[PDB]
Amino acid sequence: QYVRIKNWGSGEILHDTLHHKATSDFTCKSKSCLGSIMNPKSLTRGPRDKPTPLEELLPHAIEFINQYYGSFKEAKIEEHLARLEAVTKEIETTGTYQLTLDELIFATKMAWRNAPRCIGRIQWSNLQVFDARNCSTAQEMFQHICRHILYATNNGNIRSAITVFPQRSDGKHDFRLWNSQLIRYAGYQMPDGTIRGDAATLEFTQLCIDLGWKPRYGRFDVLPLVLQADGQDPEVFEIPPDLVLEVTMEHPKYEWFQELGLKWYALPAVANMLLEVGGLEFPACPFNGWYMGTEIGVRDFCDTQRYNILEEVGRRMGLETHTLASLWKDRAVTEINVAVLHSFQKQNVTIMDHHTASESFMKHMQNEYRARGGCPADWIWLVPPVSGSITPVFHQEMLNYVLSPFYYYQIEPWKTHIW
Amino acid sequence: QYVRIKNWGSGEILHDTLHHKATSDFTCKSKSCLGSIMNPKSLTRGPRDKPTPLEELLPHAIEFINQYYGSFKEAKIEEHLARLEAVTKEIETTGTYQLTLDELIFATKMAWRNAPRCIGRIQWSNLQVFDARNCSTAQEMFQHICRHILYATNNGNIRSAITVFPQRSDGKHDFRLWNSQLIRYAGYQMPDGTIRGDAATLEFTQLCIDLGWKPRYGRFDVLPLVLQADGQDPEVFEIPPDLVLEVTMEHPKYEWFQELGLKWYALPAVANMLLEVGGLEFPACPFNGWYMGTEIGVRDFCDTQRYNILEEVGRRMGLETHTLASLWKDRAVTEINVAVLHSFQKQNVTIMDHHTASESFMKHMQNEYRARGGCPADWIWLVPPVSGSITPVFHQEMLNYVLSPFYYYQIEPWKTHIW
Ligand code: HEM
Ligand code: HEM
Ligand SMILES: N=C(Nc1ccc(CCNCc2cccc(Cl)c2)cc1)c1cccs1
Ligand SMILES: N=C(Nc1ccc(CCNCc2cccc(Cl)c2)cc1)c1cccs1
Ligand SMILES: C[C@H](O)[C@H](O)[C@H]1CNc2nc(N)[nH]c(=O)c2N1
Ligand SMILES: C[C@H](O)[C@H](O)[C@H]1CNc2nc(N)[nH]c(=O)c2N1
Ligand SMILES: [Zn+2]
């Protein structure tokens, strides 16, 4: 039957039944738990080589179709059976099917709604879908992406959107965005061992340069897009600087802050994930939403593996920077989140603090349970990198399963690409 | 073979082989992950009813014995085989065996070393073992416990120790400490719905009163012990107030702090867990170590389900207590951890900040891997309730398995007790 789940802060108990509809085996073994593994194969969907077997495509297809029409308040039996027949023919005749633009909008919000590591899923039904399935060239991809960045950025009033490029076929003509985020900074590795810019993109940065891009060697050089259409080699496209919106970080109290010289783009859009729906796969479909404070303040700026500015901020706060026990890091990182949240609102770019996010998620989780008796949640990712216990999510038990549709990771294109 | 595991902050990768020696199935299913479930049956060892089958006792016994002698630098083949034979006879003849005091010391440190949710395991080999197996009465249990509290408290210079009361037998004459922590406060529920003291002990508190204890209705009334010897009903014993050491909390800056009227015992000792070694079970064996700041400051004082003083501390800090986005909680809880860490050191009681703890654990994890290619770690518990990302553990992948010996949870004695 169900799986009992409890929140220790409110004592409220829940029953998770939805997991019953999970696809394959997840990351965990019967006798061992690998829930802290970041990039597990259970969460990845790699390179295809031939069409996907009709035997398995048709089953999945019927599954989705049924799920779609099931979404409806008071169904359309006629319509439902009609499309059911209509899709089978197509598969039989063509080898694959196509989703009605509406079924794709449904597919994109469900895949989101089913993302265990997302804390903003309360917004799941507010998604702008840009159908670019008819696309055929890098030049065209680039245009669609510019349209998206402009729409999504909304002069600062962020809007959630996703651009759905062509579905995969034989897997030999895949559409891919070699980037990992539409807008992101470059990571260079100065001769003297030093790493300047964003260490997390050191490797991708290199490739870009290897593809003709000109390295401007600086902490905030926005990388160019690296588009791949119909499975051809990639082409490098510079984004119109007028389209990239950045926030200059400044502290509502510490004016010494500006001197740190810290800015950060205002649009968070993942460009390297695969949408899976009804047995179909779209290896290229960038999507955005808005930021949650901590993403920038705590992880981007403080991670030692990222911009690592936690000591500098402390020194400039005149803190016992050599006495771990003093809790100076707890002091630093917080003022830093204050700069980040204030620097966004000041300039009026949509931003969301982590206490509120953590809160809307419980509301969402409450709905998902009354709605469909279940909500795939990855506790490790859903809990903020700061304030753990201080947030309601922390005291909430969850179950983490992969349903369908879903947003999978993929393998670095430059790794599985026949040039 | 091994399971690849990586730290994202240092990039250093590891191979976990030790998991191969895991006992039974853990909390997770092939297709679903229940890693955030607190009290899973995979981590619990309940009431026994008859002796444990010789068929399964002997196998486990040989297992441990072999493991013990294996601990030795340059083995004692003779001795090893001798004890191997010696134990089998005993089991054959008596129905169970007894551990040489030395094998028990080894058993207590390994069970600790194998506790996935412990962040201080670097200290695993420093454990004081108090052999009370010969015990037979509540009066005797009470004495042993007083000896332990006095030794462990060490006038403030905390010392790690464990008292091993009689092993289980037919399960009908079990030794149990109905408490959950040697020293702890009481939770009363004032007529007017109010809860005063420590909400977490509301239920246990009641029982105590139900057993004759006199409710002194106050935020810090230390509960009496509730001892059960040879499987008889429990008897209530007041702890000598001279043995309980408490720290009065005060802020090294905010003198308004004292007015909060906050103190907390200085000895953290779990009294309700079961030690499992060589197929044997000791349902009664309290053990202690010292505190990690956050345990008190973040969880005990702030949890809404505990003492919940996070708003009050903020008001008294003159913070935008009605603007979640202001990050006032991040501000509060930190100063509170500063009061807690400073109030302990001032009075000279051993305390440990969470950044250092999180650090020694990585060192430990590094050793456990070079030592035995594995370390059962429960990421969710090992990561602090504050400063998540700011600590090295956060960026460390881990595997969580139950080995042997091990410290299991048990079922509330008052639930499975034939009065
Ligand atoms: C509306 C605002 C949104 C907020 C505030 C939000 C917030 C978050 C946060 C904080 C993460 C953490 C990423 C990291 O730490 O690396 C995340 C991940 C994710 N979100 Fe959302 N999200 C939002 C919208 C969306 C949208 C529009 C989609 C897709 C349609 C989405 C899909 C996901 C997925 C799949 C992940 C997992 C990424 C990964 O595993 O690498 N989110 N989200
Ligand atoms: C030396 C200092 C030690 C420190 C600083 C330490 C710290 C911790 C912390 C912070 C917890 C978290 C408990 C909670 O959040 O509820 C914990 C749990 C635990 N520790 Fe340690 N520990 C220490 C010593 C020991 C000792 C001496 C033993 C046993 C011989 C031990 C066995 C465990 C076990 C089994 C748990 C799990 C408790 C549970 O699951 O409820 N620890 N420890
Ligand atoms: N708030 C967001 N921020 C955000 C979301 C996803 C990511 C991706 C981070 N994952 C890193 C990673 C590591 C390894 C492989 C892959 Cl595919 C991806 C980053 C910021 C939003 C993203 C999309 C909508 S909102
Ligand atoms: N630092 C410590 N603190 C500490 C350790 C364990 C616990 C137990 C908390 N577990 C709660 C719980 C909940 C449900 C069932 C059981 Cl058995 C136990 C509390 C503080 C030490 C404990 C023992 C040595 S040190
Ligand atoms: C090892 C562990 O899985 C890893 O550090 C996770 C923890 N939680 C996270 N949570 C979010 N939101 N994002 C991350 O990148 C991570 N990293
Ligand atoms: C639901 C979740 O497992 C639960 O809140 C856990 C999280 N991590 C924890 N970590 C420690 N050390 N102690 C706890 O009590 C908890 N509670
Ligand atoms: Zn798991």
Side-chain angles (χ1 to χ4, degrees):
Chain A
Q1 220 165 56
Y2 64 78
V3 173
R4 212 174 185 69
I5 240 178
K6 183 186 65 177
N7 175 301
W8 296 81
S10 74
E12 175 238 41
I13 291 194
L14 302 167
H15 299 175
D16 190 298
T17 58
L18 181 63
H19 67 287
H20 292 156
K21 313 172 186 181
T23 305
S24 292
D25 280 346
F26 193 72
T27 328
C28 294
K29 327 196 173 308
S30 56
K31 306 196 297 68
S32 186
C33 175
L34 295 72
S36 69
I37 306 301
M38 281 201 97
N39 306 137
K41 296 196 189 304
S42 66
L43 248 37
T44 301
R45 183 61 70 75
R48 188 78 95 155
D49 182 51
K50 316 185 167 190
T52 101
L54 300 186
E55 55 261 30
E56 51 179 350
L57 199 174
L58 183 60
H60 288 344
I62 308 302
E63 192 56 72
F64 176 54
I65 296 301
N66 291 307
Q67 171 184 9
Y68 170 72
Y69 275 100
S71 79
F72 288 121
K73 204 321 288 179
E74 65 206 12
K76 313 163 179 177
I77 324 71
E78 48 286 349
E79 260 194 66
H80 186 185
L81 304 164
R83 176 57 169 177
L84 270 168
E85 191 190 320
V87 177
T88 318
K89 292 290 215 305
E90 197 171 323
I91 303 180
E92 266 180 357
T93 72
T94 66
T96 170
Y97 65 123
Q98 297 284 171
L99 297 171
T100 81
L101 175 71
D102 218 63
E103 307 176 313
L104 179 70
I105 299 173
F106 170 85
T108 63
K109 305 185 184 180
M110 283 301 301
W112 176 8
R113 180 178 182 183
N114 299 322
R117 297 171 165 184
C118 194
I119 191 172
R121 284 182 276 167
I122 191 174
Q123 276 286 318
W124 76 279
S125 69
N126 288 188
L127 185 64
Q128 176 47 51
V129 184
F130 286 130
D131 193 345
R133 290 183 283 180
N134 44 52
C135 189
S136 7
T137 57
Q139 180 56 210
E140 282 169 293
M141 293 193 88
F142 178 70
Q143 278 144 36
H144 281 128
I145 294 183
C146 279
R147 181 211 205 312
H148 183 162
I149 301 170
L150 183 75
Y151 167 97
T153 295
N154 192 305
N155 190 193
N157 176 182
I158 300 295
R159 286 186 296 206
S160 291
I162 179 175
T163 298
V164 180
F165 285 111
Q167 60 185 62
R168 176 182 283 163
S169 59
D170 69 325
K172 289 283 182 175
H173 320 296
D174 280 19
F175 271 78
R176 299 290 292 293
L177 284 72
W178 288 32
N179 301 67
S180 59
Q181 218 170 175
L182 270 25
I183 299 174
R184 213 183 192 310
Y185 298 123
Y188 311 103
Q189 175 179 57
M190 307 319 228
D192 40 298
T194 301
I195 287 184
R196 177 180 168 199
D198 184 339
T201 64
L202 277 158
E203 174 168 48
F204 180 71
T205 293
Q206 182 52 51
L207 177 55
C208 281
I209 296 186
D210 296 324
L211 294 185
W213 191 67
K214 291 290 167 292
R216 304 120 58 177
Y217 304 99
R219 283 162 81 204
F220 298 98
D221 303 326
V222 176
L223 290 168
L225 262 49
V226 172
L227 309 180
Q228 169 197 300
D230 196 51
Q232 304 175 65
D233 284 7
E235 298 178 13
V236 179
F237 303 66
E238 216 70 51
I239 303 180
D242 321 34
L243 296 177
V244 184
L245 174 50
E246 299 180 301
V247 178
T248 33
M249 238 58 72
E250 51 171 48
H251 196 300
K253 295 304 161 58
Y254 306 20
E255 298 304 351
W256 51 268
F257 216 93
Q258 299 85 84
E259 297 146 58
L260 292 167
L262 297 177
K263 63 188 171 90
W264 199 267
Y265 41 98
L267 189 70
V270 211
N272 55 184
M273 292 186 66
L274 178 162
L275 163 70
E276 180 279 308
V277 52
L280 297 177
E281 299 172 344
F282 305 73
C285 62
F287 57 75
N288 75 289
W290 52 79
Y291 266 110
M292 173 170 89
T294 61
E295 292 185 70
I296 305 178
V298 178
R299 297 302 289 296
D300 292 322
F301 292 151
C302 292
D303 270 20
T304 73
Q305 75 258 51
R306 300 305 295 304
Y307 274 84
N308 175 32
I309 78 177
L310 193 60
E311 168 170 44
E312 155 89 301
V313 181
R315 300 192 57 167
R316 291 169 170 288
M317 280 192 87
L319 301 189
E320 301 190 64
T321 290
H322 284 65
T323 313
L324 199 47
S326 62
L327 294 193
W328 63 266
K329 294 183 184 182
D330 289 59
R331 285 267 171 50
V333 64
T334 293
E335 287 305 299
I336 294 179
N337 277 322
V338 184
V340 171
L341 272 172
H342 159 264
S343 277
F344 265 66
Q345 290 139 177
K346 178 86 169 306
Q347 295 172 48
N348 305 291
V349 183
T350 303
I351 190 75
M352 177 171 261
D353 65 272
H354 62 288
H355 289 286
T356 307
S358 298
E359 214 179 69
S360 68
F361 187 76
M362 284 303 105
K363 188 70 196 83
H364 173 65
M365 180 160 254
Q366 275 142 39
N367 298 319
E368 286 309 81
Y369 274 94
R370 273 173 299 198
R372 50 180 196 164
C375 172
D378 182 339
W379 193 97
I380 292 189
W381 271 60
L382 299 174
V383 183
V386 300
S387 298
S389 177
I390 305 297
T391 63
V393 183
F394 182 98
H395 314 275
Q396 174 64 60
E397 291 184 319
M398 315 158 154
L399 258 60
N400 183 30
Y401 38 104
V402 176
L403 302 175
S404 198
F406 199 76
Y407 285 111
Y408 294 76
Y409 297 129
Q410 304 189 62
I411 304 183
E412 317 272 55
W414 60 88
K415 290 178 170 60
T416 47
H417 177 64
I418 304 85
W419 288 86
Chain B
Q1 220 165 56
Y2 64 78
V3 173
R4 212 174 185 69
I5 240 178
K6 183 186 65 177
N7 175 301
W8 296 81
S10 74
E12 175 238 41
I13 291 194
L14 302 167
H15 299 175
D16 190 298
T17 58
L18 181 63
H19 67 287
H20 292 156
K21 313 172 186 181
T23 305
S24 292
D25 280 346
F26 193 72
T27 328
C28 294
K29 327 196 173 308
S30 56
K31 306 196 297 68
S32 186
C33 175
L34 295 72
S36 69
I37 306 301
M38 281 201 97
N39 306 137
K41 296 196 189 304
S42 66
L43 248 37
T44 301
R45 183 61 70 75
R48 188 78 95 155
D49 182 51
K50 316 185 167 190
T52 101
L54 300 186
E55 55 261 30
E56 51 179 350
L57 199 174
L58 183 60
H60 288 344
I62 308 302
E63 192 56 72
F64 176 54
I65 296 301
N66 291 307
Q67 171 184 9
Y68 170 72
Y69 275 100
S71 79
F72 288 121
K73 204 321 288 179
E74 65 206 12
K76 313 163 179 177
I77 324 71
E78 48 286 349
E79 260 194 66
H80 186 185
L81 304 164
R83 176 57 169 177
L84 270 168
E85 191 190 320
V87 177
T88 318
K89 292 290 215 305
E90 197 171 323
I91 303 180
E92 266 180 357
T93 72
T94 66
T96 170
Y97 65 123
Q98 297 284 171
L99 297 171
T100 81
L101 175 71
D102 218 63
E103 307 176 313
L104 179 70
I105 299 173
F106 170 85
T108 63
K109 305 185 184 180
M110 283 301 301
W112 176 8
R113 180 178 182 183
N114 299 322
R117 297 171 165 184
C118 194
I119 191 172
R121 284 182 276 167
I122 191 174
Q123 276 286 318
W124 76 279
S125 69
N126 288 188
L127 185 64
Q128 176 47 51
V129 184
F130 286 130
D131 193 345
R133 290 183 283 180
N134 44 52
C135 189
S136 7
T137 57
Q139 180 56 210
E140 282 169 293
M141 293 193 88
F142 178 70
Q143 278 144 36
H144 281 128
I145 294 183
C146 279
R147 181 211 205 312
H148 183 162
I149 301 170
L150 183 75
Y151 167 97
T153 295
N154 192 305
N155 190 193
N157 176 182
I158 300 295
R159 286 186 296 206
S160 291
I162 179 175
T163 298
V164 180
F165 285 111
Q167 60 185 62
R168 176 182 283 163
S169 59
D170 69 325
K172 289 283 182 175
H173 320 296
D174 280 19
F175 271 78
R176 299 289 292 293
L177 284 72
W178 288 32
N179 301 67
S180 59
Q181 218 170 175
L182 270 25
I183 299 174
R184 213 183 192 310
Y185 298 123
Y188 311 103
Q189 175 179 57
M190 307 319 228
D192 40 298
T194 301
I195 287 184
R196 177 180 168 199
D198 184 339
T201 64
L202 277 158
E203 174 168 48
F204 180 71
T205 293
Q206 182 52 51
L207 177 55
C208 281
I209 296 186
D210 296 324
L211 294 185
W213 191 67
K214 291 290 167 292
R216 304 120 58 177
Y217 304 99
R219 283 162 81 204
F220 298 98
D221 303 326
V222 176
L223 290 168
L225 262 49
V226 172
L227 309 180
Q228 169 197 300
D230 196 51
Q232 304 175 65
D233 284 7
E235 298 178 13
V236 179
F237 303 66
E238 216 70 51
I239 303 180
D242 321 34
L243 296 177
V244 184
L245 174 50
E246 299 180 301
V247 178
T248 33
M249 238 58 72
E250 51 171 48
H251 196 300
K253 295 304 161 58
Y254 306 20
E255 298 303 351
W256 51 268
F257 216 93
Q258 299 84 84
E259 297 146 58
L260 292 167
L262 297 177
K263 63 188 171 90
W264 199 267
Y265 41 98
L267 189 70
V270 211
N272 55 184
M273 292 186 66
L274 178 162
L275 163 70
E276 180 279 308
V277 52
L280 297 177
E281 299 172 344
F282 305 73
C285 62
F287 57 75
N288 75 289
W290 52 79
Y291 266 110
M292 173 170 89
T294 61
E295 292 185 70
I296 305 178
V298 178
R299 297 302 289 296
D300 292 322
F301 292 151
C302 292
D303 270 20
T304 73
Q305 75 258 51
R306 300 305 295 304
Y307 274 84
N308 175 32
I309 78 177
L310 193 60
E311 168 170 44
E312 155 89 301
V313 181
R315 300 192 57 167
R316 291 169 170 288
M317 280 192 87
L319 301 189
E320 301 190 64
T321 290
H322 284 65
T323 313
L324 199 47
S326 62
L327 294 193
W328 63 266
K329 294 183 184 182
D330 289 59
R331 285 267 171 50
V333 64
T334 293
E335 287 305 299
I336 294 179
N337 277 322
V338 184
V340 171
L341 272 172
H342 159 264
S343 277
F344 265 66
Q345 290 139 177
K346 178 86 169 306
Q347 295 172 48
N348 305 291
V349 183
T350 303
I351 190 75
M352 177 171 261
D353 65 272
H354 62 288
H355 289 286
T356 307
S358 298
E359 214 179 69
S360 68
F361 187 76
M362 284 303 105
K363 188 70 196 83
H364 173 65
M365 180 160 254
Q366 275 142 39
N367 298 319
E368 286 309 81
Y369 274 94
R370 273 173 299 198
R372 50 180 196 164
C375 172
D378 182 339
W379 193 97
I380 292 189
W381 271 60
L382 299 174
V383 183
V386 300
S387 298
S389 177
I390 305 297
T391 63
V393 183
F394 182 98
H395 314 275
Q396 174 64 60
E397 291 184 319
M398 315 158 154
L399 258 60
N400 183 30
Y401 38 104
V402 176
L403 302 175
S404 198
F406 199 76
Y407 285 111
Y408 294 76
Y409 297 129
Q410 304 189 62
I411 304 183
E412 317 272 55
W414 60 88
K415 290 178 170 60
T416 47
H417 177 64
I418 304 85
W419 288 86

